[PDB]
Structure formats: structure tokens, C-alpha cells
């Protein structure tokens, strides 16, 4: 978690930082969600607009389901980092605000 001690230097990885049962643990969570849930409940999620929304499902729907959240690198539009920033802020999320 980021605080206010002297230091602010950027972090180029996160999962390293975040336990190895918080990653599978939220990321699942995630990626039901985006099986399950459909474009407007994806936009609930954090970093998540309407654009990105349709275009997670837009895939889906003739693709299918994802084997892995990761698989949204390969969805048009996200990348491997739009998508790596957003799983943070849930994942992050989830634990900051207990």
C-alpha cells in the first residue's frame, strides 16, 4: 500500500508486494465477474468505463469464456497493461477497503 513517507518511488511491479493467495484469490474474482456480469456491471468495476465493458463482452460472445483474466490482453483495445492496472485496483482494493 502506498503511504505518506518520504520515498514515493514507483513501483514496477505490484503483485510482487500483494501476497500469493491475494493474487489468485482476487483475480478469480475478477474474471468470474467478467464471465458472469455483463458490459454495465463490468463498468461498476474500478478503471472500467462503457467503452472497455463492450469490448471485454463483445469478445466473449463469439469467442467464449476466459480461461484467465490475463486472456483480456489479448481482447482489442486492452492490453496487458490497461488490464494489469485495473486488476490492481480491485485486487488492491479489496484489502485496503476491509
Known sequence: GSSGSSGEK?????????????????RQKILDLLNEGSARDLRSLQRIGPKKAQLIV???ELHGPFSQVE?????????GKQMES?????ILGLAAGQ
Open 58 to 60: 463483445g469478445w466473449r
Open 10 to 26: 514507483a513501483e514496477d511491479c505490484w503483485e510482487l508486494q500483494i501476497s500469493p493467495e491475494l493474487l489468485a484469490h482476487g
Open 86 to 90: 485495473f486488476l490492481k485496483a480491485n
Open 71 to 79: 486472456d483480456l490482453e489479448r481482447v482489442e483495445g486492452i492490453t
